[PDB]
Design a protein around this ligand. Structure first.
Ligand SMILES: [Mg+2]
Lengths: 397, 153, 106, 39, 61
RNA sequence: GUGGAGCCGCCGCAGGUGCAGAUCUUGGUGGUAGUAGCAAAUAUUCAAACGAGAACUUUGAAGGCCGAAGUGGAGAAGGG
RNA sequence: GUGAACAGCCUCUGGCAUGUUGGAACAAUGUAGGUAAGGGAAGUCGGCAAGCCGGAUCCGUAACUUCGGGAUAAGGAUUG
RNA sequence: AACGAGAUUCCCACUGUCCCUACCUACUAUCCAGCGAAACCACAGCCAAGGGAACGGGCUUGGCGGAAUCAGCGGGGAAAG
C-alpha cells in the first residue's frame, strides 16, 4: 500500500484498444464545421508519403535566439496526384445522428474506380455500373435523376463528394483507386451542390484544396510493428538480471481484491498499425511535377530562389522503397504517420490559431536531393561527374 | 455382420467395413463428417486434395488446440487441418466399396455415401518414461469405421 | 507437350537471403526446383549430381551467388505418372555472368 | 513360421508391458522445499 | 537389395577399411549375388571391387 | 424385445442380510486433449537400385563431424 | 601441422549420419551466445553477473617477514 | 609471515549492474505431417453491495448476460503438491 515513490502512468488510456485498425486508409473522424459565409471549398485530400529529406530555411522569429539564421528542418514529402470527383452524397440530420440521404455517381466512372468494387478483378466480368450508366442517357431515368438533386437540395443539410486517386500516375503496384468521401464546407446548400454537379468526372488539384504555409492535420495508419511484449508495446522498465522465468515482463499486474485484471494495466499484444491523426503539420511547399514536352521536361522541383539549378526533389537514386515522384507534391515539417508507399489523408484543421508560429511565412533556401540509399555526398549527377571526372564506364569512346 | 441403420433399399445399396485399424479416432471422425452425404466422385477427389493440402478438414468437435487455416472458410468454420493418414484409410476403404458395388451390380455414377460412422476400437498400450522414476502409458486409440453406400435415382 | 530446352541464369544470392548458415545450401536446391517447376510447369524435376556439386562446392553457408543452368523438358515411359513430362536441370559452367541472358537452345 | 508371426506371436505377449504402472514412488516427500509457514 | 554383407567381406579381404572400397555403382545385382569370401575375391580380379586410394595429406607447406 | 435351462409363491427355520461417501478395495472409463510434448553434444544434399509404398534401407558422388586422453582398434567384470 | 605441451584448434588411418521425428515460417516470452554512443557501480543486502588482465622477451620490483618468502608484487617497453 | 573457491571495508582499472534500453544469431515456442501423456476434477466458472461460520461463483437486491475458438497472460479460483 502506497508505493513509497510516485510515478505516472505508463502509456495513455486515450488510445486503449491497441488494435489493428479496421481500415488501411485513414478515416476522417471529423471534418471542420462550416460557416456558410465563406467561399465554396473542399477540406481533405488523399496523399502518399514517398520519403523524407531535409531543408535549409532562413528562420524569422523575433524574440528568439535563432532569429535571422539558417536552420535545417526535417521534412516529409507527400506525392499528390489530383483527385477526380465521382459522386455526391447527401446527409440529413436526425436525432439519431447524420443519415445518408442518397448518392448520385458520375456519368461514366473510370476503370481504376471500378477495380475498387472487386476483391477479384481477374475473375470478374466487370459488370459493375453497366445498368447505372444508362440512366444518364436514358430520358426516363434522367428526368428523375434531376429530381434527386432537387430532393437533395431541399432536405439534406451537409453534402459531400466522392473522389479517388489516379493510381496510374504512381510507381506503386496497386492500381486500385482509393475512394474517399470528403465534405464541401462552403456556402449555402444550393451553392454547395451546384459546385459539385459542375465538376463530376473532372480533376481537382491539391493547390486548389491546400496552400503554402497553411497548417493542416495528417491522418493515417501507423507503421505496423507486429505482436510485441510489454517492454515495447507500453515501455515498461525491464526487471533486474537475476529474475527467474523472464526479464521483459511486467511484474505485478494487480492487487488481490479487485480479483480481476484491470484494463489500465500493460500486457503484450499488437503494436503498430493503429489509426492516428497528427495535428499542426505546417506545409512548406506545394511542388508541381514534370510539365509539358516542348520544354522537353522541366524537372525543376526543389529549385529554391537561392539554388537556381536543374534539380528535382526525387533524390539521386530514387526514393528508397517508394519509386520516383512525377506528380505534384506536398512537403511537411516533421514526421508523418505511416510506412512509405502508404495512403494518408491530408486534412484542414478544425481549430483556429494565430500563435505567431503558424501564419508566419517561410522561404526555402535549400533542399538536398542527395542519396538516401546510403551516405550520399553528391546531389545532382552533373555535380558528381564534374567532381569525379571520367571513369572506366566508357573505356572505348 | 450387422451394421448401424440397415439401408432403406438393400438391393441398390453397398456397404463396407474395416475393424481394429490403427488411425487416430479424433482425426477420422471429423474427416468422415466432412464426406457424409457426399457423392463418391467428389469424395474420392476431396480426399486426394487433403493429402496434397489443397483442401482441408474442419475440426468441429475435437478442436482443442487445432490451428486456423484459410481453407476452412469453404465450410463456414475457422479451424481446420489435413489428416493425411486418416484421409488415406477411408480412401482405401472407399475403393473397397466401389469394388463391392460392381460385384453387387451397381452403377458408380450415382453412389453417394449414405451412412458412415467411426467408433472406437480397443486400445493397445505401450509405456513411456517420465521424471522421478515413473511409468505412464502411450495408449493408442484405433477405430472401427463403417460405411453404407446408396445410389440416388 | 513440348520437348524444348533452354538455358538460364539462377542467382542464388537473391533467392536465399536471411537464411541460417546450415539451411543455406539445402534451400539453394529446393529453390532451383521451385524455379524449374514454375517455368517448365511440371512437378517432376530431376537435377543431376554435377549441379549438386556446383552448389555444394564451397560448403553450406557460402553458395556461389549465381549459376548458369539449362532446363530440359522431356517425356517419360514404363508406367509413368499421371503427369508424363519432366524437367532435367543440369549444370553448365561459365567464367562470366555479365551480359548473359536466357537464350533458347536447340 | 508360416503362421507363427500371425498365430503364435499375437498370443505371445501383447500385454507383457503390464508390470504395475506405478510401484509407489518411494522418493521420500517431494516437499523438500523448506516452507515452514511463519513458524 | 542389401549390400551390407559384401561391404564387410571386401574390407576384410582387401585389408583396408570399410571407407576405402568399391567404385563403379552400376553392377549392383552382380556383386549382390556374391555371398562368400571365395566369391568376393573373384570380383576383385574382375575390377568390380577396387581399392579407392588414400586421401591426400601433402606435407608441402 | 433379447437370451437358452432352470425357477418361484405361501407356512416355519437360518444368516458372511440391503451402500453414495470411509484421501475405502479391485477392475473399468472420462474431461483435460489430439493438448503438453517428441529442442544437450554444428549437417546434410543429389541421383540410381530394390521395392505395393523411400525425408530415414543399400549404393555412388558431394559437403561435414570424431581428430590418436577418438564417435578408432582389443580385453577384464557383468550379460548369455 | 601449430605450440612449452598427452592444452585447444585443423587434417590423415579407422569410424559416423548429429544422437527416440520431419517440413514451412522467424511474433511475444524464454535458453545459450554476442555488441553498444555519453556516463562509469549512481544499480544492488552486497561489483552478483559480465568485462578487464593474460603468452614470451627485456627492464623494474614496496611494506612486511619465521629472512625461505612476499613475487608473474606493483609499474613499464617490445612482439608481424 | 606464508597460505585461504573463508568473513568484511575502501581504492585503481574495467565494464549494459545501472541511467535506458536497443539490435543481431542459434535453439525452441508458433503452424503443419506422423505419434501422443500426466497432474487435477462435487457441480461448475462475469460483477458490485448486503447479510451469512464476520473475505460468495451459486443466496438477496442491483449491474447485466449470444455460438465456437487461437496466441499469450500470471489478478483470481482463499489453484495444485
Ligand atoms: Mg466523430
Amino acid at each position: 500500500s502506497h508505493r513509497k515513490f510516485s510515478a505516472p502512468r505508463h502509456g495513455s488510456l486515450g488510445f486503449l484498444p491497441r488494435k489493428r485498425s479496421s481500415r488501411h486508409r485513414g478515416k476522417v473522424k471529423s471534418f471542420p464545421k462550416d460557416d456558410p459565409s465563406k467561399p465554396v471549398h473542399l477540406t481533405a485530400f488523399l496523399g502518399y508519403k514517398a520519403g523524407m529529406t531535409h531543408i535549409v530555411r532562413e528562420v524569422d522569429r523575433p524574440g528568439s535566439k535563432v532569429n535571422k539564421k539558417e536552420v535545417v528542418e526535417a521534412v516529409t514529402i507527400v506525392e499528390t496526384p489530383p483527385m477526380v470527383v465521382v459522386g455526391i452524397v447527401g446527409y440529413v440530420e436526425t436525432p439519431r445522428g447524420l443519415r445518408t440521404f442518397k448518392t448520385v455517381f458520375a456519368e461514366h466512372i473510370s476503370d481504376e474506380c471500378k477495380r475498387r468494387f472487386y476483391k477479384n478483378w481477374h475473375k470478374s466480368k466487370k459488370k459493375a455500373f453497366t445498368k447505372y450508366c444508362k440512366k444518364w442517357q436514358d430520358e426516363d431515368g434522367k428526368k428523375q435523376l434531376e429530381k434527386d438533386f432537387s430532393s437533395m437540395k431541399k432536405y439534406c443539410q451537409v453534402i459531400r463528394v466522392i473522389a479517388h486517386t489516379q493510381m496510374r500516375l504512381l510507381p506503386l503496384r496497386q492500381k486500385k483507386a482509393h475512394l474517399m468521401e470528403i465534405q464541401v464546407n462552403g456556402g449555402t446548400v444550393a451553392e454547395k451542390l451546384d459546385w459539385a454537379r459542375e465538376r463530376l468526372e473532372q480533376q481537382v488539384p491539391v493547390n486548389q484544396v491546400f496552400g503554402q504555409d497553411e497548417m493542416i492535420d495528417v491522418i493515417g495508419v501507423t507503421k505496423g510493428k507486429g505482436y510485441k511484449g510489454v517492454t515495447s508495446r507500453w515501455h515498461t522498465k525491464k526487471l533486474p538480471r537475476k529474475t527467474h522465468r523472464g526479464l521483459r515482463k511486467v511484474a505485478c499486474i494487480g492487487a488481490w481484491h479487485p480479483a480481476r485484471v484491470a484494463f489500465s494495466v500493460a500486457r503484450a499484444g499488437q503494436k503498430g498499425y493503429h489509426h492516428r491523426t497528427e495535428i499542426n503539420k505546417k506545409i512548406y511547399k506545394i511542388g508541381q511535377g514534370y510539365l509539358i514536352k516542348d520544354g522537353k521536361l522541366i524537372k525543376n522541383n526543389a529549385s529554391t530562389d537561392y539554388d537556381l539549378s536543374d534539380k528535382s526533389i526525387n533524390p539521386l537514386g530514387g526514393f528508397v522503397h517508394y519509386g520516383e515522384v512525377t506528380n505534384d507534391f506536398v512537403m511537411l515539417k516533421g514526421c508523418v504517420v505511416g510506412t512509405k508507399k502508404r495512403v494518408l489523408t491530408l486534412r484542414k484543421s478544425l481549430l483556429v490559431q494565430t500563435k505567431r508560429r503558424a501564419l508566419e511565412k517561410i522561404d526555402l533556401k535549400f533542399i538536398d536531393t542527395t542519396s538516401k540509399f546510403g551516405h550520399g555526398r553528391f546531389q545532382t549527377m552533373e555535380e558528381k561527374k564534374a567532381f569525379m571526372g571520367p571513369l572506366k564506364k566508357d573505356r572505348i569512346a | 455382420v450387422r451394421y448401424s441403420l440397415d439401408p432403406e433399399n438393400p438391393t441398390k445399396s453397398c456397404k463396407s467395413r474395416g475393424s481394429n485399424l490403427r488411425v487416430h479416432f479424433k482425426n477420422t471422425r471429423e474427416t468422415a463428417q466432412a464426406i457424409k452425404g457426399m457423392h463418391i466422385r467428389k469424395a474420392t477427389k476431396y480426399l486426394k486434395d487433403v493429402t496434397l493440402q489443397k483442401q482441408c478438414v474442419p475440426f468441429r468437435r475435437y478442436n482443442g488446440g487445432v490451428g486456423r487455416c484459410a481453407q476452412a472458410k469453404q465450410w463456414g468454420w475457422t479451424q481446420g487441418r489435413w489428416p493425411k493418414k486418416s484421409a488415406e484409410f477411408l480412401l482405401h476403404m472407399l475403393k473397397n466399396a466401389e469394388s463391392n458395388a460392381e460385384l453387387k451390380g451397381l452403377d458408380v455414377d450415382s453412389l453417394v455415401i449414405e451412412h458412415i460412422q467411426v467408433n472406437k476400437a480397443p486400445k493397445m498400450r505401450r509405456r513411456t518414461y517420465r521424471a522421478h522414476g515413473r511409468i505412464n502409458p502411450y495408449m493408442s486409440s484405433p477405430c472401427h469405421i463403417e460405411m453404407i453406400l446408396t445410389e440416388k435415382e | 507437350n513440348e520437348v524444348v530446352t533452354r538455358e538460364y541464369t539462377i542467382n542464388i544470392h537473391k533467392r536465399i537471403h536471411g537464411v541460417g548458415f546450415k539451411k543455406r545450401a539445402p534451400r539453394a536446391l529446393k529453390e532451383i526446383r521451385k524455379f524449374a517447376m514454375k517455368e517448365m510447369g511440371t512437378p517432376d524435376v530431376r537435377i543431376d549430381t554435377r549441379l549438386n556439386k556446383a552448389v555444394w562446392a564451397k560448403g553450406i553457408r557460402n553458395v556461389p551467388y549465381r549459376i548458369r543452368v539449362r532446363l530440359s523438358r522431356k517425356r517419360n515411359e514404363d508406367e509413368d505418372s499421371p503427369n508424363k513430362l519432366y524437367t532435367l536441370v543440369t549444370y553448365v559452367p561459365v567464367t562470366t555472368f555479365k551480359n548473359l541472358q536466357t537464350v533458347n537452345v536447340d | 513360421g508360416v503362421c507363427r508371426k500371425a498365430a503364435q506371436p499375437v498370443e505371445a505377449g501383447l500385454q507383457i508391458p503390464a508390470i504395475l504402472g506405478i510401484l509407489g514412488g518411494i522418493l521420500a516427500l517431494l516437499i523438500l522445499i523448506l516452507l515452514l509457514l511463519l513458524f | 537389395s542389401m549390400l551390407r554383407l559384401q561391404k564387410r567381406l571386401a574390407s576384410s579381404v582387401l585389408r583396408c577399411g570399410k571407407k576405402k572400397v568399391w567404385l563403379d555403382p552400376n553392377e549392383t545385382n552382380e556383386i549382390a549375388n556374391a555371398n562368400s569370401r571365395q566369391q568376393i575375391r573373384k570380383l576383385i580380379k574382375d575390377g568390380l571391387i577396387i581399392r579407392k586410394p588414400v586421401t591426400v595429406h601433402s606435407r608441402a607447406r
